[PDB]
Amino acid sequence: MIRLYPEQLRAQLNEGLRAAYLLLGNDPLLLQESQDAVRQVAAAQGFEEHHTFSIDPNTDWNAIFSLCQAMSLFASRQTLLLLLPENGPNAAINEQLLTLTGLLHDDLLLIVRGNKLSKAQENAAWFTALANRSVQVTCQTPEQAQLPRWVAARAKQLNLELDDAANQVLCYCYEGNLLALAQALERLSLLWPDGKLTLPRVEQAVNDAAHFTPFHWVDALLMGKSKRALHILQQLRLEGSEPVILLRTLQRELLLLVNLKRQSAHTPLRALFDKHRVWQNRRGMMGEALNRLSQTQLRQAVQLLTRTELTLKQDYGQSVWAELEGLSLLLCH
Amino acid sequence: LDDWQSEVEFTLPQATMKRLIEATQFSMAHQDVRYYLNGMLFETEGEELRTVATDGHRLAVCSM
Amino acid sequence: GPHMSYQVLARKWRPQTFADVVGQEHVLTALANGLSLGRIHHAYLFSGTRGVGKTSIARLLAKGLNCETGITATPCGVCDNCREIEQGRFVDLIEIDAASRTKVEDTRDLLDNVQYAPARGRFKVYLIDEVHMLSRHSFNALLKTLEEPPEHVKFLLATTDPQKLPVTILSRCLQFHLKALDVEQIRHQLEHILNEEHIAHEPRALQLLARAAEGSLRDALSLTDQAIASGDGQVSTQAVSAMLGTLDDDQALSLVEAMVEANGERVMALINEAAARGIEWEALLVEMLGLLHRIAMVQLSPAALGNDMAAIELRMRELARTIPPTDIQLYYQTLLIGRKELPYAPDRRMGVEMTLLRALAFHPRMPLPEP
Amino acid sequence: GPHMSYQVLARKWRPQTFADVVGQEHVLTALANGLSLGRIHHAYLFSGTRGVGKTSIARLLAKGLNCETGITATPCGVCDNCREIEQGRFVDLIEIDAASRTKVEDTRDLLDNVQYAPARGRFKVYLIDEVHMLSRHSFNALLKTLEEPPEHVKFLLATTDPQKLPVTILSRCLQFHLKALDVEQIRHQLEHILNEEHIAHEPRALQLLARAAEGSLRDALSLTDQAIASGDGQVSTQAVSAMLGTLDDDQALSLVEAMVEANGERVMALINEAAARGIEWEALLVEMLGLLHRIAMVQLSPAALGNDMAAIELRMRELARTIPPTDIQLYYQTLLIGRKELPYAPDRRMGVEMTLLRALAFHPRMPLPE
Amino acid sequence: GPHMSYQVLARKWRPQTFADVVGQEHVLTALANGLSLGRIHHAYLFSGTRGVGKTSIARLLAKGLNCETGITATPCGVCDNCREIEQGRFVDLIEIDAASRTKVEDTRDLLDNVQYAPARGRFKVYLIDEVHMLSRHSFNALLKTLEEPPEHVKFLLATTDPQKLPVTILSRCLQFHLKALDVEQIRHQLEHILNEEHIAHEPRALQLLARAAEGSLRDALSLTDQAIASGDGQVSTQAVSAMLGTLDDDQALSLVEAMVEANGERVMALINEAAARGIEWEALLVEMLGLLHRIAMVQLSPAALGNDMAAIELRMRELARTIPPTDIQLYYQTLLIGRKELPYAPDRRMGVEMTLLRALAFH
Amino acid sequence: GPHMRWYPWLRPDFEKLVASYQAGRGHHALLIQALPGMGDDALIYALSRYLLCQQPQGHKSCGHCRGCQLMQAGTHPDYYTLAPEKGKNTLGVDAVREVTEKLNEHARLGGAKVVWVTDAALLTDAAANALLKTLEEPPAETWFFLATREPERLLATLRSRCRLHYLAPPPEQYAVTWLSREVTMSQDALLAALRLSAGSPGAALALFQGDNWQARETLCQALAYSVPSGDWYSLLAALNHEQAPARLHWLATLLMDALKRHHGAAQVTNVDVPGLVAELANHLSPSRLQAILGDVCHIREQLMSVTGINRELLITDLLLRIEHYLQPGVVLPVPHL
Ligand SMILES: Nc1ncnc2c1ncn2[C@@H]1O[C@H](COP(=O)(O)OP(=O)(O)O)[C@@H](O)[C@H]1O
Ligand SMILES: Nc1ncnc2c1ncn2[C@@H]1O[C@H](COP(=O)(O)OP(=O)(O)O)[C@@H](O)[C@H]1O
Ligand SMILES: Nc1ncnc2c1ncn2[C@@H]1O[C@H](COP(=O)(O)OP(=O)(O)O)[C@@H](O)[C@H]1O
Ligand code: BEF
Ligand code: BEF
Ligand code: BEF
Ligand SMILES: [Mg+2]
Ligand SMILES: [Mg+2]
Ligand SMILES: [Mg+2]
Ligand SMILES: [Zn+2]
Ligand SMILES: [Zn+2]
Ligand SMILES: [Zn+2]
Ligand SMILES: [Zn+2]
């Protein structure tokens, strides 16, 4: 079975088509781009009828025999699309897919979208019978190491001349989804049709991407800027950001910070920096985060964090924003 | 499983049973709080079969 | 006097021009250059907070996309194409409120419409507002009409709750997020509206209305309309107070002030007034401790106050200035102990009263008299 | 035994003439002024604590609007529509349980039936009681009619907590608030009502019930009918007290005076004679706590004692002069804790006795010698 | 035949007339006088702890209210309506368990029901029990029918705790606080029952059973059934003592005298022995609390000795003499808080060990 | 597992608890109180088999009949079980509602109408109050059963209808002998298992056959480095296995044994780690030790009670607080209120 990457699919589509297509991944930008690229390829090859189905646990046999009846002989050529459940194929569809694999014709072009599946799901017989006939596309979101390179290439296909500072800020503001990178790139291109992405131009927008959760709220505390993170929290409460998510971010990050604080007395800093495999761009702030905030500060911060999470959990919610900004104002000392 | 012996045995014309049920069926409770209402009472005495249905606002009695 | 009774400010002041839209310039410039250049997408979605502009920007986009002058970023607003929308009746524009339309039958009825050519305009516009109430099957139908849009088919979508939508619908459509209107933006737009209507007004009244509306400009206009009707066409901060401050909670500032200042008679009058309104005592103690914590923690950094305390800064700063942290810690200990002791007191009123008395007796500056 | 009597004083003595609404002078003044001057808003929101008259005032105004013609300030004689209003025969008077119409579809159904004005009357009035439990979408649905309704339809919304419901609805037309009735007004109303029914009443019982009623005539009337049931058509002090269960506040006063005076034997005497009186120990502790809060109260102002406390005001003054505030707070803390752990004591009497004995042992001046 | 003619005492000895109710004269008198004089209220709210009689008083009130022989404070008990209401098969007394019927569908059903005529009795009465857990929507829909019902509608509310009622719901109904039954009342009712059912007993076990059940007659009868299930169908002091696992004053005083002198090793050995015999730890703590209370009484006034048993009162007198009141107060407070935290302790034995070892803190 | 497992020391109790039903005087309800894995489940199962069996043999169930043949197939139409679904943890009002609405109908096979609640503490209080009527006054030939680790946490009303039968854990020597016959290792481990589990032999079996024992060993080793160095933070990895309640319980048991070692007591629970006990006594001050033990128990309670609480944050704060307390000059908390 041909496993491909989203950029390399087009060439394959030009060379020859496959009756069955699979789109596995979490990032939906490349999912939809690959889907409609294949669809326009089929339309360029005379495929007219395009059926899509949303397969859920509610979807069942009586939701699939119409599908089977569809692709026998109606007119010219047609295409089919499916939506898979969040956990991948189940036992209910394990037989439906086996039945669907029994009838493959050039009349119908089969398209399947979804996320990553368990290794026992492709181990099923229908997948093995579909190996030579189908092509799978990898559609996960890779790490941030290749993020600047990929976004620079993308902006080149979007005809945008980014600066190094513009690239840095756009990457740093949107490490969540290629949808965010897109919408930012098209917003910038439409605002400035020229294509030169100067840092003063790209910084304006509305704010640093969105009110986000982590980036500047945590970073200012890492460097100790009370005003910055405090205004960020004010904006977060203005837009009604979920306090539980903020607490989860603090829980996942301050624990790593505490791990970093230990061993610093009897081990050089950089050894601790690379022992945890923490990102170097993050290490550049972890340095002064450890230097400024002492062990007593860490203990007090974790204590108030536990008190806050407690009071929040049993449906009290006693001014969660006040205690969050209290955490911030402790971490700024 | 061993069948249960019957203490009330009889045989009826289909017309009689159909008339009784049509006479009282609309008169019995649905999911009502009083558990003993959601049903039909089949009284028998002498040579007469009587059928009673109620929902607290209605009553159908049919004797044949 | 009877101003706006004919046309509520929200309706009366619906922006017919891009210059009439205060704020959202990040979206306005993008829309203008997209219309002028021609980078028009098959679907546009906007995300905002109630009275943010979503219907306004959608209707303006309808004007600019199907005006008699052509696809123009600066609609005339006087042509037949523009005036049809301005009155509200445009044949090729279909405005739908999804709150009352969650069924699949009506969605399929519009699905059939997506195919025919526009009767009068260049393109058919299907504006669906507050789309988050659409059913799952209605969402699937919308996706099916998103994937294969005819040339004359443009979709404008808007909803106050954009994350309720499925992933596919968000992925298919280009999203613009309207920033919640700042208090200054609302105040400036309101001042311009009132000045253009030739009516007397007061500045602090506009500021209070903007603070009360909480970012929604349509709600702000409706609230100011209520003020105009109640004030008989006059905007007075007195009437503004009488309408919003009465429903708003204005307490524990006087309580904390008097308790720190050791005014027993004033705090007794304050507790009597609190009991008169029938308010909750545990919530009162929560408010007291919250204000006390804020006052204490402002001493850590002067920037600790956000715009949430717009009516408190004038008192908050002065109170936090003349106070020692040790006294605040003692007061907080007392109030926490009192809140713990509240449920077992004879009455929650009596309990909070006794806690206030315990605070007053242990007042460092003014200890309670003893015979 | 059998009978056809009773009317439930709550179900009998509701105002229907604007002269029986006791207290709430503000709202009655506003309503009279508006009706006489012909200025009527499109939405009325009566708020306030429970048992005060908001529903009764709503009925009052509704029947004052539609009563054989005539824009009166409520007085309306030989008014048919009024008499069906007070008889439960709905005449353009639509009471709605908002909890049965929380969903936005139900309130949309409420909206679309707004045009049916001419039904043996001029105005059709809507009483969406407990309005604070509507859904947000339902609030928005009714808001459109709220801002500009038909002339003939008047909204009257009743709620307990105005904080809950959205601000926009709060601000729409009006928001009247009914304060809790004072025990003095409750005394007047109970005395008047029991006078109307040729039933004798001891003023001590009236004061007991008035204070036992949390400023709400419906609580006061329920308790008063309970008192009438407990006796035989007569309310008496001892019957009322045995009904409430509250002991002699003088028994508790002697107990706390003994606790101050550090005579454990007298404390034991009082506690055992109170046990023989069959009183609840929790009640004894809470009454002593009330007395302790009162003796702390007199430390700040002499007016702490209510009118009834004129019986024991002198002893209050003496204890306040004698005992410094720190000792009052020590006793209050000791007894408040003791009440907190009373449920876990081996016996309620055992726990109360131990708490008193502890307040004696930790006596600030003269503790129990070792 | 095999249909279990036997019924549990907790239900067989349910009150059947206003003269069969143990205690609560403060509410029986009011109810009977209201029945007789002609003042009957359309909503009665009986509230009290478990096993004190809210349901029974309400059912007797229903029996009286719709008896065909007028409306009397004394139901005849031989008529039809009395018999069905006693059996619970009467159409016009409808039992609604508010835990189930809290959705708006069921409340709407009830409000639909109240608009019609009765079927057999004068009054159609809804016995709603555990009302304090109707969803807020249910209560707000129920306000109208609880305030001004038709002529033949009366409501009887039974609640385990009034606190959870919306206070407005409290205000429209007639509150009856059923007092917890005193130990003397419980022991006398138990004596009368057991003599009636020809069951051998002795007063001591009755006092133990009354003490164990904190003022709940149904609890007293439950413990009676437990005490007759074990011990050849009879009530005896040894049987109830084993059933409760209670301990004599000697062992608890050994614990308190070892702990007051900081004899930690002795205290832990005593706890080990008590665990070996397998006592109930809450019983140990209540016995320690009782002994400390008696010591405090002796300290206050020498008249109130330990004379209920007066077996080892020498030790109590000596301990009172040799310990300041403050130390006894601290010991009582520590043991009491520990008692409060038995359920939260990972184990009962270890919770008592925590409490005792913490009492060992003073020198 | 399959029909669970009978336990040898349970035979007396059942006999007594069947006599009350042989005479016909059996209280319909029954609230069996027994420790987790104690064996109350087998008792309830055997009782129900005797009750719904059409021909009840003397102290046995049937020997041969369809009435309990449908019981063995687990498909009897009267026998109802109330357990939360495998994917959930709270027993909803809906299941008890269905069972109680289907109780009002007659007995299908002409016998009894037996119900069973698998675990009563899991009953939501709304479900308890929906089941209150059914327990207080059931129809004829209707019986009930319930299982609780402790009765005091149950609703004040539900236990008041029921008889609070108790399952005494077997004598210490007998339990040790049974566990030795089942599992083979040193008696110190067995005594630790029994005393830790409050005497539940089934819980000792679960500790051994479960991985936790080795993890328990891990904790010991970790403490063997922590207490001599005042470095407790490194315990985090040991105390986070979704078993924070159980592991915190083991830690509190160790601290209990140390405080016992101060006021030298003949018997302590942890007998497999006497050196650890001695070290814990040596390094830690008694007031600090009691404050730390109180914090450990408090955190275990906070984790056990509130689901959805973050285990990592709680345990991290606990370890930081302990490290703070080991510093001289700190003020320790005391239980109150
Ligand atoms: N950005 C804005 N500029 C000018 N007026 C606005 C703006 N946002 C809201 N409004 C005012 O509110 C009224 C209704 O606006 P609308 O755009 O319909 O809000 P929505 O996002 O909730 O559909 C408009 O008539 C206009 O007066
Ligand atoms: N202001 C008042 N004047 C006269 N009677 C009152 C007043 N307030 C309450 N009541 C008595 O209480 C009964 C019920 O009052 P209601 O208005 O329902 O109080 P609520 O505000 O709690 O609904 C009335 O029938 C009346 O007897
Ligand atoms: N006042 C009482 N007099 C006599 N028996 C009582 C009394 N209270 C409770 N009981 C006993 O308790 C059993 C249950 O009483 P019940 O009235 O159901 O209490 P509840 O108020 O909790 O529903 C009765 O069957 C009766 O044996
Ligand atoms: F029109 Be908006 F969404 F309030
Ligand atoms: F409406 Be009230 F609270 F009785
Ligand atoms: F057991 Be009772 F109904 F409180
Ligand atoms: Mg809109
Ligand atoms: Mg009312
Ligand atoms: Mg009951
Ligand atoms: Zn135009
Ligand atoms: Zn009139
Ligand atoms: Zn009778
Ligand atoms: Zn069998």
Numbering used by the authors:
A (entry chain A): 1 to 333
B (entry chain G): 119 to 182
C (entry chain B): -2 to 368
D (entry chain C): -2 to 367
E (entry chain D): -2 to 360
F (entry chain E): -2 to 334
The authors write:
Clamp loaders are pentameric ATPases that place circular sliding clamps onto DNA, where they function in DNA replication and genome integrity. Because the sliding clamp is a closed ring in solution, it needs to be opened and placed onto DNA by a separate ATPase complex called the clamp loader. All clamp loaders are pentameric ATPases of the AAA + family (ATPases associated with various cellular activities). Here we describe a series of structures of the E. coli clamp loader in the process of placing the clamp onto a p/t-junction.
In micrographs of the sample containing ADP·BeFx, we observe two different conformations of the clamp loader/sliding clamp complex, both with the clamp open. However, the degree of opening is drastically different between these two states. In the first state, the clamp is barely opened and adopts a very tight spiral conformation (overall resolution = 3.9 Å). Therefore, we designate these two states as the Semi-Open and the Fully-Open states, respectively. Unlike the Initial-Binding complex, in the Semi-Open state, all five subunits of the clamp loader contact the sliding clamp. These additional contacts between the clamp loader and sliding clamp help stabilize the initial opening of the sliding clamp in a spiral conformation. Interface contacts between the A and B AAA+ modules and the C and D AAA+ modules are strong, while contacts between the B and C AAA+ modules remain minimal. In the Semi-Open state, there is a gap between the B and C subunits, which prevents the trans-acting arginine finger (Arg169 in γ, Arg158 in δ′) from interacting with ATP. The Semi-Open state, which was predicted by rapid kinetic studies, has all five AAA+ modules of the γ-complex gripping the ß-clamp. The AAA+ modules adopt a spiral matching the tight spiral of the clamp.
